[PDB]
Design a protein around this ligand. Sequence first.
Ligand SMILES: COc1cc2cc(c1)NC(=O)/C(C)=C/CC[C@H](OC(N)=O)[C@@H](OC(N)=O)/C(C)=C/[C@H](C)[C@@H](OC)[C@@H](OC)COC2
Ligand SMILES: [Mg+2]
Length: 215
Amino acid sequence: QPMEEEEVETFAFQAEIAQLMSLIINTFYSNKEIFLRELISNSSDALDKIRYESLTDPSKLDSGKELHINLIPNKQDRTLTIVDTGIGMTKADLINNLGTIAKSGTKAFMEALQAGADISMIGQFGVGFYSAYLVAEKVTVITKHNDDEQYAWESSAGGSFTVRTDTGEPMGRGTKVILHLKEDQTEYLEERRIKEIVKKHSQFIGYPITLFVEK
Ligand SMILES: COc1cc2cc(c1)NC(=O)/C(C)=C/CC[C@H](OC(N)=O)[C@@H](OC(N)=O)/C(C)=C/[C@H](C)[C@@H](OC)[C@@H](OC)COC2
Ligand SMILES: [Mg+2]
């Protein structure tokens, strides 16, 4: 019954990453659907990493043998969740790779946009994760790596993100991206739309992908 206590750490995004997020959020782009391609591609890379690590150390699969991606639309919460059982990320990985450290592709990509380039090019510049903000007002990343505890990263943009130990349902290993969709982007909760986008953009994943549909 006693009051629970939880630690949170708040971080500022690196300057160019903050500028990138603002550009993605406040500019109109057609072809926003490519966000799902980018997230699935990141999952595939995380899956490749645990796969190859396990060839040399099979104990790394003690946290889960199955290597796959699950897509979970939730119309009640208005969330689309992409879950993989890839290598996952440590706390240090989250902090370094999801916000605080500069990427070499950020500037070149922003300038490419502000010249008319299609947003689809984002993955080539190594900042494809941020395409989530084309469709989501808030993104929560839950992750579990063999070498660390389970962590939750979250940002509604505006310049900062938080990291905390996750009190939610334990995952054996991997990463779960929860997209809290903007009110005008609920088409990405529809089964037909999700299937269309995966069929169009994500046909060479290398791992099984399953769509879970309520009701
Ligand atoms: C193309 O491949 C990459 C690689 C990187 C960045 C991006 C794409 N591109 C990005 O835009 C960023 C900021 C990705 C952040 C990291 C991704 O997180 C979300 N959910 O998309 C995460 O994905 C999942 N499912 O685990 C990935 C890919 C983690 C991999 C395994 C891990 O390698 C050891 C990361 O360092 C810890 C790599 O970071 C660099
Ligand atoms: Mg790949």
